[PDB]
């Protein structure tokens, strides 16, 4: 479980848009430093830039 440190606006049809503070579960790293993530906050799933999140405490 990770937390968003920034907002992120989707730039592709498979990205996940998220707000700062959202809690995310990492599904896989099938896009490299782009991770497939599921937002516990919104229920959506999509790719995120891994440098925009950090582990939940």
């Amino acid at each position: 479980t990770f937390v968003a440190l920034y907002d992120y606006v989707s730039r592709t049809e498979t990205d996940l848009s998220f707000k700062k503070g959202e809690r995310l579960q990492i599904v896989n790293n099938t896009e490299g430093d782009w991770w497939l993530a599921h937002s516990l906050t919104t229920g959506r799933t999509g790719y995120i830039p891994s440098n925009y999140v950090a582990p939940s405490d």
Partner: peptide
Amino acid sequence: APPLPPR
């Protein structure tokens, strides 16, 4: 914000 990684 930091730069987006290459995809």
